[PDB]
Amino acid sequence: SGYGDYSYSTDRTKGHVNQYYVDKARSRSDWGNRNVLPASEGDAVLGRTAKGAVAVPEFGIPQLDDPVLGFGPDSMVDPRIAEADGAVWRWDAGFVDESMTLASCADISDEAVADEAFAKFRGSVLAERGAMITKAESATASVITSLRDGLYSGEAQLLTASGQRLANVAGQEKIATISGYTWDGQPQTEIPGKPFVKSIGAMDYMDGVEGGDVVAAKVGAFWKPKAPKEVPYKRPMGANTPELPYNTVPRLV
Amino acid sequence: QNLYSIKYKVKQGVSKLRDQQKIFETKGSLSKDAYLSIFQAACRQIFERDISTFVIGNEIENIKIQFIKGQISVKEMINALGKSSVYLKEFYNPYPNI
Amino acid sequence: SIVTKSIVNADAEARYLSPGELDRIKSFVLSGQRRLRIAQTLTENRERIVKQGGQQLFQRRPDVVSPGGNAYGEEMTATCLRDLDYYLRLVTYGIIAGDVTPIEEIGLVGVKEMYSALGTPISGVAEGIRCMKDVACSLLSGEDAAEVGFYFDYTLAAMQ
Amino acid sequence: SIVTKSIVNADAEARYLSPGELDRIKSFVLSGQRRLRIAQTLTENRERIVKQGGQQLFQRRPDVVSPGGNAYGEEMTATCLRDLDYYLRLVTYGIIAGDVTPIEEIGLVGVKEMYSALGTPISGVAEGIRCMKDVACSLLSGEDAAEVGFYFDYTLAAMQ
Amino acid sequence: FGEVRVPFRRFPTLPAANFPNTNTLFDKQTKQNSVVIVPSFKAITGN
Amino acid sequence: MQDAITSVINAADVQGKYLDANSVEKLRGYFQTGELRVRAAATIAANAATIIKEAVAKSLLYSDITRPGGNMYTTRRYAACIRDLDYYLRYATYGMLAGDPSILDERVLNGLKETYNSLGVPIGATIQAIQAMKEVTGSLVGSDAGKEMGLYFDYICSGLS
Amino acid sequence: MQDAITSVINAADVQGKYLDANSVEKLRGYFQTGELRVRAAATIAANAATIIKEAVAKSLLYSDITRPGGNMYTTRRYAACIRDLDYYLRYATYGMLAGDPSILDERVLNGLKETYNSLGVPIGATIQAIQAMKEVTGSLVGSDAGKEMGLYFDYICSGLS
Amino acid sequence: MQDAITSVINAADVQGKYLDANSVEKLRGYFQTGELRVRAAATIAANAATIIKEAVAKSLLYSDITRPGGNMYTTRRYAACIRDLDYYLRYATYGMLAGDPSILDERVLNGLKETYNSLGVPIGATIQAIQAMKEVTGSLVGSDAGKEMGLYFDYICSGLS
Amino acid sequence: MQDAITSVINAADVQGKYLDANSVEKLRGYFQTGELRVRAAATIAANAATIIKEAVAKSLLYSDITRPGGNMYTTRRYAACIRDLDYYLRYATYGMLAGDPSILDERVLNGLKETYNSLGVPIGATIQAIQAMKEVTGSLVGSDAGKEMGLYFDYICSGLS
Amino acid sequence: MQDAITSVINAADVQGKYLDANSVEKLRGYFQTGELRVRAAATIAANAATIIKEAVAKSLLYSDITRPGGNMYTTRRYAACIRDLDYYLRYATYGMLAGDPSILDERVLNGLKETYNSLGVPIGATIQAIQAMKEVTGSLVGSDAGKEMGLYFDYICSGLS
Amino acid sequence: MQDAITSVINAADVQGKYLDANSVEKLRGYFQTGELRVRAAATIAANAATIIKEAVAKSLLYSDITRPGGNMYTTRRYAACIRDLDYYLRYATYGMLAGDPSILDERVLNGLKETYNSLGVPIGATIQAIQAMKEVTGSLVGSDAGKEMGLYFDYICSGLS
Ligand SMILES: CCC1=C(C)/C(=C/C2=NC(=C\c3[nH]c(/C=C4\NC(=O)[C@H](C)[C@H]4CC)c(C)c3CCC(=O)O)/C(CCC(=O)O)=C2C)NC1=O
């Protein structure tokens, strides 16, 4: 794109907004009324520091050539250096604040804080993890029972191909057999009168096989055996006996 | 007249899609399949397609069982459908608010 | 990822992350080191885990490898072990992410449709995952095995 | 068309055509031949049908051709006979389609608005259609005339 | 829609350009492109 | 959508004409093949899942596209593509019953290439899967119905390419 | 959206690879800075209104755009623009927590230039207001978090320009 | 929408100005013609159906567009087009009362050419029907109100062409 | 381009009319002011460089836009903007001589806002520089010619905003 | 451009196929009608000026578009439109000789609606002039060649609408 | 175009700054790798034809796109695509020498997706051919230069997708 290239990002300029009370220090009278102080050394007055002093060339002549005595890379930093340039006061530009430094945060290689840490993390996520697992198996039990109770076997379901895959699933997992069609499109049936009549016997009346072959299927009150199922007596129906016609048979209805 | 002129005149139209549309709604005393196919029609309108390719299966199950039992109206099922985690994942996360 | 999910759940409400969400992100980044260690252990013991899970599956479900079963033959058995390796890799992803988003977005959404279209019994896959769970938890400590089986259990629940 | 309507009504429910709809499509394609024969007979006797219907209309409704009536003058009477020919053509379309979709989509939707904007009494058009119905059913057999008047009756009901 | 009907496509006439915008919405397939069909209505003179 | 009957009626109505001998010719042609069409549609509705399964097995089941990096690697993508194939089969059956591919233009092909290009779905593999489905479908329904179905299968493939 | 962890896992998964030493390098890098990220996000959530107020005061509060004829003259427009700045700050915070600007692409920058161009919103003034917000935010959160936040601020400004 | 008064107030407010002599000039101009505008609007509301009927009779009633093949052949299309003409007349009356065509831009012309092009509605015949309606309307309301109404009729025709 | 004479002739010719009393009114109006227009155009041609120099000095010479980061910092940009101001002055002079701003529409304003937006040129500063040029130009040419020139200066500023 | 032979060869070559029985069917069909095509092209070349003159006389010669205000009022516009009609006739003859309208797509219809819309040329009047030219041309060349020519005339009208 | 040095100088100049320690850091980084860059560029210039030949042979040489119906079936298309691959390799080499992908944005990616979409060139196959070229190029130039070249190869693929 070249060298002198305009960017909105790098435009610190009031040209797109017309704030006509802002320019650059020009007159000597501008230091008392409009301008404050340079924010860096590039913006400094020519040949002076950011604070207004004459710039001195920053480095001397090392006395005491010696690796053990004499200043070297191991020498500690004299505290009066930061005092000399005024970096110890909070209103100075070079005032360092270590509370938000990266160095203040905790090391992660330290095993100690790591094991202190993981327990605190598990403590929060335990409840939500358990809740989501409970929800998943709730959904599974619900679909098993509505598979066993006739849902998903109406012919509007058996026409779509995903309904056919669900029927093959229900068959393959031995949950229930869904009567579909023959290869040429005619409805299956065990008694040729009406369509979709399925077989029965010896497994329509067995318990504990509601979701057979489904791994750890918790359906109902799995934590106990079930009541003995006996009520072999007839209660007279008062005002609720189905009144039928005399000397005839209710054909159909 | 020829195939080019006839094809131009047969197509001039809003579209036949406007006439060739059917509405779903609960009438009196529906069975449980009738409720199911209405719920599946809602999933195609709010999600634009059948759900089974972009969900696990346990996300709107309690909403389906509730509508099939006759406990919530069509409007409540659509409201509950629109504020599910499925709707949030498909039509809110990948797009801007506009 | 926990950070991602916190950010979206805070984004829908048009608010910054509350101090609870930030607390939880902090606890997560603090436990990331043992998360990486556990992922290490599960990752580099993959061969034994897949092998021993395949054994327990084939002894518990001899029909799938019986003559004609879905995984019948050398190639089909290799493909089934490939699937088990897929799911072990996803479990390691979920362990490092701190949440089942990687497992669920890859390998759980639409898994029933895929396995029904392939003709594979999903209960057999659930059995294989359970066997791999036992084998993998055998190699961890108490608390580590508890936290690691936390994801196998979710994968089993989603695969009912 | 019966096929089209069955397809849309099955499409809204997101299901294939049930065996009842396929049964009805089959019965329709089997009767298509006598449908074409009846359309033949009605189609190629159009001049007598329009003429004799126009007579019965003008004798039953002398006001429309009386001095100043909507169809008063040579040109207006010709235009009214043109309209009757339009509706006979639409009835033939409906007979071959097996359903009033062609008649209703062309010539029935918004017919009241058009005839009110033109200043034409819609009851006169209904009378003309009834007269054409009698004339046309006179040329058919019993069952054929019954099936053909089936559409004239719908056109009359929509034109009340 | 009331409380009994499922929403549907609804070809509109008099909302002033609701017709072509609705047609573009429903005629595009899911995830067809990244475009936003109605980013805003073009500004009118006034407030 | 318009079927053969609707198209004939439209061609006649767009000229102010009554249905003449050529319209009767086309109408008889459709009415003679309607029963075969119903038979084929029933048989295809019977065996949709097996048709899709066999086409996928013969076309792209063991190729590299189902491998990591392929477009249909994860379970989401596999399920999405088998749903797409189900769409294609169902709409081809609709077109075969109607005797007119206008439903394919209005409900399937409109903006499909652009969606696939934005998603990154390979078009050649899709066309080959549809071609494999054409084989199985013609196989199952016999020669005449297979040619009828292959007409609309090739229509979809040409609209996609 | 994908964070740093999701991006690393995706790069590894798109090649059928296990997480090797470079993935561990990036993951450790994110895990070391996560706590600083949480601190910065909390502090920014604390002072959002004051940050927006100070940025608006230093950038466009007394310029000519707030006078009659300016884009944000009436009260509707002033409120709308401060809401926009709140959006930018919140989404930059999300991006800083995630360590990945993909949320900015998906939820912010997608179709934003076109909306602003149709409305007539000046883009340069918006970019300058975001730059002023970057100053105040880095000021409030300190040097390291300020550089992190400025990364996503500059990302938004580049996507807008 | 903005009328003449709203437009003058906006032009004055967008400069931070008080309403000076030129604004008073325009405001007096509108206030002098307001009563004629109300008279014309009442008369047009009285005879809308007859105006549309006569315009349709003189413009496109016996042409080939009303015959088979033409746009507006069937009864649906005839009713739709007379409803369109009613829309045009009502909105032209609104614009004449307001003394400003901005309502036509916001509520009528926005996306109208594109809708007509997608539907296949002939634009030239529509413009000619609007021109015929302009004749009858100016006829019924007299010279001055007819010129006022014809201003907005021509505005609609230019926005449609 | 069309001047006042061309516009009057076009308005008369587009109706098949001969030039009647109102056309004569407008033509006399232009012919009476033509000599003042020629005087003003000569004076403006005499002092174009000084006009541009003084307008730039009073409008944007010492602002922050000429400082590093401004849009007109480097020498390329300074030269480009003074060339732009020369364009504006020359075309305003053409429009004043012609008595018709159509040349400004055809040769200046067509696609200017879009070019400036793509380049990043601040529109407000440009409008203010044109306003300052209007002051100096009216100053130099006197009251009547200054109002004439300010008409087209304001036309350019309105077309740019 | 591709004629019928080129199109058949391309359809066969794009599949790696040799020219089978269906290609022979189409090729024989073209070869049987080639001589009639040459006769019609010669006759049309003989009477192009009279065809255009008669079509213009029956379609738009005395309408209001030739009067002041109408498109084609001045002599420039009249000459331009008769040149356009000559273009349409010549390219329809090319398409009839080739038996393929691809030349019309490549050399005529590409960007024609946009040019006419930018110029302000009425599309409906153009389509009606082409329809009138179709009448005269079919008249002069007889029934079969007239249907052949009307195919491409209607192709141009559909591409223009 | 701007290289690494130009980009650093621009970043420093757009703030009125002198080149400070970070600029020196980046400049030293570029100067240390320049000699490796020159070596890689020479080696790539040596073996461009063989690189393109091997990439085409491994990526799309025997696929169905080179057969009838495929995009690069005829000899024109084959030559055009190998010329395209030569373009990509040469511009990636330029970008590697410069250490900055701006030349790819200015001279390659600008309007490339739109050209390919108008022509019908498959984007996925192109990206895969570029990926295969990345393999061979990294192979030939060794690990470090291969990573450098793969940076710009992936840049082109991302700009194309
Ligand atoms: C308020 C501004 C506004 C207008 C004007 C408008 C027009 C509009 N005109 C329409 C249709 C139509 N418009 C016409 C009009 C005409 N046919 C002709 O030949 C004539 C030249 C012309 C009447 C002068 C016809 C025939 C249709 C029906 C198209 C069809 O059924 O395919 C439709 C489709 C909606 C529907 O009927 O279902 C809309 C939305 N919408 C608006 O919001």
Ligand SMILES: CCC1=C(C)/C(=C/C2=NC(=C\c3[nH]c(/C=C4\NC(=O)[C@H](C)[C@H]4CC)c(C)c3CCC(=O)O)/C(CCC(=O)O)=C2C)NC1=O
């Ligand atoms: C295909 C469906 C369809 C219909 C029906 C149709 C009707 C239609 N009837 C018309 C006129 C007319 N129609 C009549 C009809 C009648 N006068 C009477 O008194 C009787 C009650 C009635 C005859 C039974 C008359 C008199 C006119 C001319 C009205 C006039 O010009 O003032 C016109 C205007 C001129 C024209 O014919 O083009 C149309 C478009 N258009 C259609 O597309």
Ligand SMILES: CCC1=C(C)/C(=C/C2=NC(=C\c3[nH]c(/C=C4\NC(=O)[C@H](C)[C@H]4CC)c(C)c3CCC(=O)O)/C(CCC(=O)O)=C2C)NC1=O
């Ligand atoms: C990352 C998530 C993910 C999964 C899980 C996945 C599964 C997947 N399993 C497949 C096959 C298969 N999977 C099995 C698996 C089994 N057979 C049994 O009996 C057992 C119950 C079960 C093993 C535990 C078999 C036998 C096949 C081959 C089926 C065939 O080709 O007929 C295939 C087709 C061929 C291939 O592997 O590329 C896919 C795509 N893809 C994915 O992206």
Ligand SMILES: CCC1=C(C)/C(=C/C2=NC(=C\c3[nH]c(/C=C4\NC(=O)[C@H](C)[C@H]4CC)c(C)c3CCC(=O)O)/C(CCC(=O)O)=C2C)NC1=O
């Ligand atoms: C009724 C006409 C119609 C079609 C066909 C249609 C397709 C369609 N296919 C989609 C995705 C898809 N389609 C495929 C398909 C395939 N992958 C392959 O490798 C094969 C070649 C191919 C199957 C043969 C895949 C994998 C996706 C998922 C893309 C993704 O998740 O990124 C999506 C994105 C919606 C979503 O899944 O969230 C749509 C809308 N939409 C329609 O309205």
Ligand SMILES: CCC1=C(C)/C(=C/C2=NC(=C\c3[nH]c(/C=C4\NC(=O)[C@H](C)[C@H]4CC)c(C)c3CCC(=O)O)/C(CCC(=O)O)=C2C)NC1=O
């Ligand atoms: C990076 C390349 C570059 C250059 C060189 C540049 C020059 C430049 N010189 C300027 C002024 C000026 N320059 C001078 C310079 C001089 N007077 C003399 O007698 C000497 C011959 C000469 C000094 C050696 C003066 C006096 C002004 C102020 C003129 C005025 O305001 O009247 C100005 C207007 C005010 C400002 O400084 O912002 C610019 C933009 N801009 C650029 O982008």
Ligand SMILES: CCC1=C(C)/C(=C/C2=NC(=C\c3[nH]c(/C=C4\NC(=O)[C@H](C)[C@H]4CC)c(C)c3CCC(=O)O)/C(CCC(=O)O)=C2C)NC1=O
């Ligand atoms: C005849 C009508 C007409 C105009 C007006 C026009 C303007 C125009 N101004 C341009 C640039 C420019 N225009 C300016 C102008 C300005 N900078 C500011 O800060 C001020 C507010 C403003 C001057 C008042 C600048 C600085 C550039 C250079 C942009 C760049 O180098 O990136 C360019 C780019 C061409 C080039 O310089 O290479 C064109 C084409 N073109 C035309 O055909």
Ligand SMILES: CCC1=C(C)/C(=C/C2=NC(=C\c3[nH]c(/C=C4\NC(=O)[C@H](C)[C@H]4CC)c(C)c3CCC(=O)O)/C(CCC(=O)O)=C2C)NC1=O
């Ligand atoms: C403003 C410039 C301009 C001119 C000049 C113009 C001429 C023009 N002259 C015309 C006809 C005509 N012009 C004539 C003229 C003549 N017959 C003779 O023998 C004489 C030599 C000559 C009279 C001096 C005739 C006879 C017609 C009718 C031709 C016909 O309809 O067959 C027509 C067609 C009908 C109509 O008038 O609308 C036009 C457009 N149009 C324009 O826009």
Ligand SMILES: CCC1=C(C)/C(=C/C2=NC(=C\c3[nH]c(/C=C4\NC(=O)[C@H](C)[C@H]4CC)c(C)c3CCC(=O)O)/C(CCC(=O)O)=C2C)NC1=O
């Ligand atoms: C329809 C016009 C047309 C032509 C001609 C064509 C040629 C063509 N020739 C090829 C290869 C080839 N062609 C040859 C041919 C020869 N070796 C010799 O020594 C002989 C001189 C010559 C045989 C007479 C060989 C050996 C290859 C393989 C080169 C390789 O893979 O290294 C390839 C790459 C692989 C492939 O066949 O798909 C193309 C595309 N493509 C076209 O579209």
